[PDB]
Amino acid sequence: SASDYHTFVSSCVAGIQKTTYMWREPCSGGISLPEQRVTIC
Amino acid sequence: SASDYHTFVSSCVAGIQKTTYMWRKLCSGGISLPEQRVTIC
Amino acid sequence: CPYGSYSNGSDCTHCPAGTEPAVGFEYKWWNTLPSNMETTVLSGINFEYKGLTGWEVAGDHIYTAVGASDNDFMILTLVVPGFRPPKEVARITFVFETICSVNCELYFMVGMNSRTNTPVETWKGTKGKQSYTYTIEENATVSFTWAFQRTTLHETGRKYTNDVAKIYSINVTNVMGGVASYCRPCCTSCPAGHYINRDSGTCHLCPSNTILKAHQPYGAQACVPCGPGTKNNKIHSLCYNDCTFSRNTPSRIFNYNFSALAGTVSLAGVPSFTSKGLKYFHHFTLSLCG
Ligand SMILES: *[C@@H]1O[C@H](CO)[C@@H](O)[C@H](O)[C@H]1NC(C)=O
Ligand SMILES: *[C@@H]1O[C@H](CO)[C@@H](O)[C@H](O)[C@H]1NC(C)=O
């Protein structure tokens, strides 16, 4: 499902945050790995 | 070198932090994947 | 009794027009030997056709008669020219009762398309009354010969006549040029997925995800719903697997996929050596779904 990939978002410290999602080190097919995006805090 | 994994250390927010260490995996050897650590900020 | 009328032995009544004309063989008694079956003796010592009377009727059951020697085969050849269709071209069912003592072989053979006889099943030793059903793959000329051997070992004289094979019940289904001992209900063939019903009076469709059996025509009783994680085929002959199984779990829904598994694979067992030098290996062709 969608909630299967591990969430590893960085929060707003020093004005920078990173939102990157990747699968667990141990899912087949499904939606591709979402890319990271940068936004001001 | 061990630190060649991508570090997703959760920046201090909501009174919680995660020292998450995850492999990027062309590397070999080195210290095994270190787990996340919890401490108040 | 002419075809279209069914008798049980006391009276013959005409089959109703609502039921399809079904002709089948049933010989529960043997006061008169049916014209289809003929008897012969194959002498075991010389392996030549003796031309004697292999089996003797008794009014209720037919058993094996003693020939030149007890080792001689007691053949009883029944031949049907073709099969009248209403996998079910012929479901023949037997009632074999063997009071035989030792070295008792009932070489029930079948000749598909008048080929060389191949023994489908070979009963050995004393056995009680049981029903055996055989399936014919495709329509052709088929002969059922029940070769009997009282003794495998050869001994001079007919000292073994107690070994008798009683076959008092013969049923043959979907036969050509035969009597209509029982007429099945039906009058056109309903399209695939519709169960034939005579009480309803019209072609009625089965509920979705159900497969219909042609063995029991009347009603939807033979129409059986498919199993879990399967889909019904358009022919309703057999259930189909979508190759994608979706099951529920408290965390989320699991959707296992088997799409790439539809194609066949050639995986064989390890080379196995027989008790003697000859070797073999089982090879199984698997087609999971699709
Ligand atoms: C033989 O068995 C079948 C079972 O499907 C039955 O329908 C048929 O009536 C039987 N034969 C006779 C002569 O009753
Ligand atoms: C079965 O095959 C025979 C020839 O061996 C043929 O005479 C008969 O018509 C066939 N039955 C059919 C087509 O229903």
Q: Do A28 and C257 lie within an 8 Å CB cutoff?
A: yes
Residue A34 to chain B, least CA–CA distance (Å) = 15
Nearest chain B residue to A23 by CA: give it. B22
Asked if C29 and C207 count as a contact pair (C-beta separation under 8 A), the reply is no
- CA C204 vs. chain centroid, Å, equals 29
| Beta partners for residue C109, in sequence order | C119, C145
- Interface list for chain A against chain B, based on CB atoms closer than 8 Å: 8, 10-14, 17-18, 20, 22, 25
Which residue in this structure is represented by tokens 């008794």? Answer: C58
Q: Which residues on neighbouring strands pair with residue B8, listed in sequence order?
A: none
Spatial separation of the C-alpha atoms in residues C48 and B20, rounded to whole Å: 89
Contacts of C157 (CB under 8 A, 6+ apart): C69
C-beta atoms surrounding C206 within 10 Å? 20
The Cα of A11 is separated from the nearest Cα of chain B by a number of Å equal to 5
Question: C80, C171, C213, C221: which to mutate for ligand 1, most atoms within 8 A of CB?
Answer: C171
Beta-bridged to residue C94, according to DSSP, are: C132, C170
Q: Whose CA is nearest to atom 5 of ligand 1?
A: C215
Cβ contacts of residue B38 below 8 Å, gap of 6+?
B16, B17, B18, B19
Determine how β-strand C283-286 pairs with β-strand C265-268: antiparallel
Judged by CB atoms closer than 8 Å, whether chains meet at A29 and C252 is answered as: no
Way it was determined: cryo-EM
Cβ <8 Å between C252 and A1: yes
d(C-alpha C2, C-alpha B28), whole Å: 88
Contacts of A28 in chain C (CB under 8 A): 257
C and B touch with 3+ CB pairs <8 Å, answer no
Tokens of C125: 């030793």
Q: Find, in chain B, the residue whose alpha carbon is nearest to that of A14.
A: B11
What is the amino acid identity at position C205? L
Distances (CA, A) of C88 to C26, C141, C187, C254: 17, 15, 19, 40
Quote the DSSP letter at residue A2: G
Nearest one of C2, C8, C173 to C89, comparing CA atoms = C173
What is the rounded CA–CA span in Å between residue C129 and residue C276?
38
Candidates C229, C290, C233, C230; CA nearest to C263 is: C290
Distance C157 CA to ligand 1 centre (A): 42
* Ligand 2 pocket, Cβ-based, cut-off 6 angstroms: C 82-83, 85, 139-141
Neighbours of C6 (CB within 10 A): 21
> Is the separation of the CB atoms in C55 and C67 below 8 Å?
no
Residue list, ligand 1 pocket, CB within 6 Å? C 24, 26, 93, 171, 173, 181-182, 215
Assess contact for C226 and C209: CB atoms under 8 A: yes
Q: Which of C134, C135, C173 best tests ligand 1's pocket when mutated (most atoms within 8 Å of CB)?
A: C173
Q: Return the bridge partners of C49, or none.
A: C42
- Please judge whether A11 and B22 are an interchain contact, meaning their C-beta atoms are less than 8 angstroms apart: no
Residues in chain C that come right before a backbone break, where C and next N are over 2.5 Å apart? 86, 186
Report how far apart, in Å, the C-alpha atoms of C55 and of each of A36, C38, C240 are.
Answer: 89, 9, 49
Residue of A11, A24, A25 to mutate for B, most B C-beta atoms under 10 A: A11
